[model samples]
Target: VTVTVNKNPSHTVPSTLYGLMFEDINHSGDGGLYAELLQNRAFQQVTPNTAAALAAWHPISNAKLAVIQDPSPVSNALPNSLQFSVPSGSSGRVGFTNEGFWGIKVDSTWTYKASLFFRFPTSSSFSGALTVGLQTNAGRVLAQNSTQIRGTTTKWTQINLELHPTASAPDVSNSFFVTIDGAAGAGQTINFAMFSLFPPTFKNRPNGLRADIAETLAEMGPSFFRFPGGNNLEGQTTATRWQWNATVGSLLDRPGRVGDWGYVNTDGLGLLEYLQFFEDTGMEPIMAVWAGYSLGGTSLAENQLAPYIQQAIDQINFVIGDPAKSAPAALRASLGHPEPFTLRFVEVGNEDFFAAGSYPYRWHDFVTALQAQFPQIRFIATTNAWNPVLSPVPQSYDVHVYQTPTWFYQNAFYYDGFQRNGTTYFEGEYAAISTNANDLFGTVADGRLAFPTVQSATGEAAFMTGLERNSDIVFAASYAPLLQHVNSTQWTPDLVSYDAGSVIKSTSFFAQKLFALNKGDQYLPSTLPTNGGTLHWSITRASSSGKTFIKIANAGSSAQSLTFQLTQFNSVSSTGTLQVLTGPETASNTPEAPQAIVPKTSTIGTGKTFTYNAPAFSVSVITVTTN
Candidate 1:
């Protein structure tokens, strides 16, 4: 295989071309990213007038668990909780035990912070004490810490305590506990709501992310995070959709809501927390607003679309709250993110093709209102369902692809022939599904989806070459279903997977991460003589940084030696990094062995001319500094 380059590369690749997408599906939010250890931190299982509370938690202690209705509630979102009662001076211990997401992984020398709302009513028998512990079922206390709660108070007081373990946990075996009993002698009467415990978070910020998983994503130098997505942005019904209002504020008030993905969201990963995540990673926010469409084939008419359009406007104002005193800005400031968030594109919906032809009617309402209010912000359409030929052209549109590995390799130049005159694209959700036998958990009742494998990831990388080559038109693209939990996945071939004990950066993850971290400023025109269904390549460069990124993907079963000729530069680095991602095409990572397939990096010799032996079913990236 031989390739030639255009020395006078004039097109500048969009800096935001490679990013990430996040949705709550497949336990990506609660169990995967959010650092909150307790699954349902707030007692939301029991409604205002319900049979019981605390479904994920139960007390096996001497203290009686009675559903207590707060005459003076903490917040309307949380109205009832368990009342732990112990007679005065009784030595009996009463506590609620919460198993981890299946099981908790506790580490030694690490500290955990916990906070819970307690009301030591003036009518209570005595001053109370709270004890928090992490212990194994074998009845050995790995760590225990407590603090005294002053009684004779008529209101709720939140207690914050840290568990500093001197001894390391032998293995990842234990559950979290909130022990309620007297401090030595005094009996306790405490009303608890929004019981929250957090292990050290991603960046140690308040309400931060899971450290392990967050760092995994941080390694990828992503440009943006297109968030709260897939079909979740459009709920099964209008009422149950993602509402930014109820999601922010005190945890006591933000009761978990129903997600379209067969589970309820703790909403702890609310609007404010999401912006903070951007702060931690420096990834821009590509906010997707909920348009007047639903997956249940319910489309709101144009007459009913105005209100929802305004809601989307308000949502945008909250993110880029630079106006300072606006209501949305004020709320954002009060939440501690006073500065405006960076946003360029606001997606109006998620694959609105479900709306048939009515999607653009709703889309027009949004464009009309948003364009009038915030003319500076650009918009992207979810689908071209309303246009026969991309009419009423959006500044950009989203495209989703779920196909087998063969399709991706075949469609490497799918966009090359498209008319890029007035419209642009955002390939926001695209993944190569494998035909190889894939492991399906309970999330798929009859196992309808394919699991991610090296075969699929290689094919996807091969397709990325086309997107990168056409970056001037397809400005940005991110992989779908960014995260998945082993037990609760609704989709397969996700970028990352994890269980309570392990984090599986799938073969696909290394592929995407490799691409994300090695971004270039301008597209170096590379003409490939031997391409389609075999080998693909993209050459990009950064003049100011004086570096050239050469990416090659071999999707077929046979390897190829490609002669790479460089021009427009006097000299190139003799020794540079050669990062290759290759494995058995059918191989993948399992929680039991997450390192089954990963990227391998080594130093290589290059001097403006070299023969790169691209391995079969592999994606290799070479970075050479220019002189």
Candidate 2:
């Protein structure tokens, strides 16, 4: 029996298969990129500061303030300096009542670092410290810390405290109250400012991350993070759009806005925070600037588009600017980002194809203006026009696919035949929205349409191979709506799904990550004839290490045995790892019971030309070391 091994000694593989797509849209928050899963975890809620305290301050009208006027008086009228003033001596404790002093809620069972600025009257010598703790509705202290406020010098001072809630703090929803205690008339009046509590952020206190979510992202080994997306940056109306400037500075002062995601955004995860997230994850930020319109089909006219253009320029400045020179960078520094962020690719809009007429002129204007100012940065246009008209041509053109899983499975070779004069391709937003259409587009049950799935993740592995084979033309690719809250899903078949606690990885996610993680930096000469059904293979060389990585996807309904043959390298060891993502073919993920799909790893046999059986409808990544 003769087993054929294709060899091409003269054809050297390309040096770099630039992982632009992996670096661009893989890390945005909606897609589970930033990893902080808790909604409204930060007290910096950006809604309107109305009375329910839903926005910022919660008012308690029942409490009163009492003052100690005499030098040694037991209890006098409480001073007027307190912002939340208690009625004068109503409680007769010479302390401010609960009316003015409000408590904020921290629902997670995690250590929280909190700080508050306070001022006191110089006349009293308050030796005691302030008490802050996470308390339950029953007034039980889960975790508490006390810090001394040493000075009685009528000036404002900051007191920092850390609280780690215990498991006993059940339900933890109504847990509130950060209190200040006086040393029995030691201080006359006190004022508070800039209060904050932060759980573990991505890095540390100042810039760390929520512990649980961060772990999930680490598991995925994501290569890129797309930012400011999906009508997130673009607003329905001019006043409601994502204004980068509004997102900066103190969290309390940064007014929040309505997001396209059907909720109010505090903007705490603002521009700088996003850059920090990218840095923390070791992923590049795929910056997507607003292109003068929202998903609602509203757009700025050419004559009225200059401000948006300037906003884009400023947005770029904030990312790659010199903190010392640029005003936006200065603003970023003032918002606790003393260092500037690095950026490369800039996408003009999200699903701008929904806009009427040709977007070519708009693309031209943006490219020309951006290139003139910052020629080094690459510009990506969002359109499938075969002949895109723009000066210096766009670095890449984005293509979106929202078809059925079978369509993707059948058209797996679409990219294989795609002809681009060298301009890169970005499969910016794509998914199979067919079989799981109900999950993405909302379902109709009893004359009522329930939540629909956003994507069609089924049969995605077969489609991904096309991308791997045509890496030369496909510079970047990312799954859209990277995340979907099972309880309130706008789209389905997302890469990752999570609720308050657990997370499940979609089959598509596993396939994409496996390909990206095991991908070589360069594509080598290789091919699998159309007749090579059930078994598929491709090879590439790492740009940095020159190591070779091979990828194979078996889509047949039955397990198939296969043998790999390689030439040009003698005594090469196949002792590499294999990562696989598989399911029972009909598996799906839902909000109530989310673990229906996930990725698992196993080993493949090792040898110069090893033979193994690949499970049907599964994606496998094999790495080989060459001497």
Candidate 3:
């Protein structure tokens, strides 16, 4: 093999190249990332006009207790809640135990906060104490706290309790629960709604995210977060679109709609939470607004979309408006953030290419409206977002790609000769999706199909090399459907996957991590004689540290021997390090075996030149400090 480095560079890589496209999919948010441990917290999931208010919750009662539903719940948003009757001589306590979302994760040396809304009838004789306990199925108490309710009121009352495992709890593997107990007043019934519990979250903020999940993402070196999206931005019908307004202020008031992916959305991960996430991760937010079009061909004319357009404008106001001045931003402040959230780049819709002809007109309406409201913030349009024949060219376009492993490798140079003159590009959603190598494939997977393999990650890494090479045109990019909870996903090959107790990153995750974290300000020009084999490479030099990094992906089934040739290369380190993310092409990681397909780093020999051999089916990053 032959290689050469040019003294001058052609383009610079943007720090925003590798962001994360986050959406609520595959139980991604409700039971996944949002950090709220309880599922079906609100009795809203139950059918109306019934006593079956407790769905996932179990009522443990004696002859003195009868657990039923309140015809008139705590609030209008919460129409049903637990109404329990404690007869005069109650032998034992009566309340309910929630199994939590699958299972509650309990750890030693961690504090858990639980809050539940309770109310009593004005004429009822209910004045008693409540016990909120975090215990195991084995009847072992891990953490416990109590709340005392003094007087009866028709209005709903909320109690917040904190519990720290008195000692290092035995284990998280066995699982835990948040159980509520009450024993008391004759002829009295206490109503309950919106029971919630949270462990130590990212930065320990209220209504925050899981510690582990947020911790990993915060360290992934992501430059931005594209939220509330993909198909989620447009629901099956406009009536059910992911409305930002329905997801803020208070948990009970945030009535979740049906997700486009087919399930009830808790909206627990709402607008305020998303903005807070951006703050916590230190990543900029790329907000996506519902654009009056649904995936099921429901479209509204621009004239008819006036309300939606106004809603979009209001969304921007909620994010960037003056908290001290604007009513909308003040609402955000009321949700715990006194300051306006940092936001830029509003995507009009997700995969609007499917919007057919209505999209161009729709895009025009949205762009004009948004630009008028906030000319400072840029807008990103879906590919074919504007019709060349009828609509004005877009300022920025999102190019989404979901392909086979081989297709990604083949299209590594997809934008090499394309118009650097047109619109700035954002590869918003991409995945080299394939079941296995030596295959013929076309698209996404059902809930039951394939997990991403090492080959798919390797192919994606190879494809990204080209994206970096043309970073001038392709400004920023991120992988779609960022997270999935095991046993409940509608999509496969997601970048990250987690269960109730554990989180795992795919092989593709490591590839993205390496590139996202070790980005360079300038691109280094290099020449490699591939001889038509399946080898892809990207060479970048960091001016900040004078570090030259060579990234290569060998999609071939066999190892390839290559020599680095640099003209005036004076090595800063006698020996360089070679970081190889190698595994069998079909290798994959599961909740059980998360480390099966990960990157492996090692030392390498280097000087003005070095002979480095890339292993079969590997993604390698070779780095050497330059003079």
State the TM-score for model 3: 0.92
Model 3, span 235-310: residue lDDT tens:
8887878887888887768767777786678788888888878887788988898887898898898789889998
TM-score for candidate 1, residues paired by index: 0.92
Q: Least accurate stretch of 10 residues (summed lDDT) in model 1?
A: 439-448
Q: What is the TM-score of each candidate against the true structure?
A: 0.92, 0.76, 0.92
lDDT of 1 by residue, 343-454 (tens): 8888888887766477656776778788778888878887752353333467888888877687788899888888868677889988875453342232334432345777
lDDT tens digits by residue: candidate 2, 139-162: 555667887665454555667787
Question: What's the C-alpha lDDT at position 265 in model 1?
Answer: 87
The ten-residue window of minimal lDDT in model 3 covers 440-449
Computed on alpha carbons, the lDDT of every model, listed in order, comes to: 0.77, 0.56, 0.76
Sequence-dependent TM-score of model 2: 0.76
Give the C-alpha miss distance for residue 64 in model 3, angstroms.
11
Clashing pairs in 3: none
